[PDB]
């Protein structure tokens, strides 16, 4: 007798539906979400049964005190990620304590901690408040670093500037290692997303983007609060990034994991990342 390994999944998934209506006028029951997503296994982990996805994706959400927003995120994204036939896991990196938020350091934590679970080769870094409006917008990696949230409703569906890298992005393991990860030292200063962009183009990379219709995303907010925010200006950090990118990153990532929870729909890692010192 002879066994046959599973086929790799197709380049293009045949399960996609295209555009989706994203609304926030209804409560979310995470137990129902789990029941409606029965193939999602403990810790927010899924892989296709019929095929071997090339996309081994850790989705990393930097987090503090945003549970109700996280529920909407899980409600919308789990169905999309399954339809995209991804071998994926959800990581919510929760910053313990009440010091200034350090988004990029928590992203770096997620990279390192996710790798202790599984041989992931792609990392999606996502704001908890951003939901894609079209499941052709792939939550996985490309030959170039990928900017996923290209047309956000809160910016009028405009891209703030050509170098804008905020919201949702995807880097391969290799892209991330080549840039020495993300800066840990920004804390509340501003510009970590521009720093990351600068790292990538200093390393010869060129940002890839879905087209602007496919790449539309909705910000979680009450309907009464819908409005166009001002587009952000670029932070001036090019020279700074060049000076510091090799000394601030994976090789300076200091943290302690305080507790880990494998909930049905996500893994939460609560961490002490120290202080702006």
Numbering used by the authors: 122 to 398
Lines from the paper:
It contains a piece of the stem domain (Asp99-Leu125) in addition to the catalytic domain (Ser126-Ser398). Even though the proteins have crystallized in different space groups and unit cells and the packing of molecules is different, the lid is observed in a similar orientation, except for residues 346–352, which are slightly displaced (RMSD ≈ 2.5 Å, data not shown). The Trp loop in the open structure lies in the vicinity of His361 and Tyr307 and makes short distance (<3.8Å) hydrophobic contacts with those residues as well as long range (≈7Å) hydrophobic contacts with Phe356.
Beta-1,4-galactosyltransferase 1 (B4GalT1; EC 2.4.1.38) is a family 7 glycosyltransferase residing in the trans Golgi.
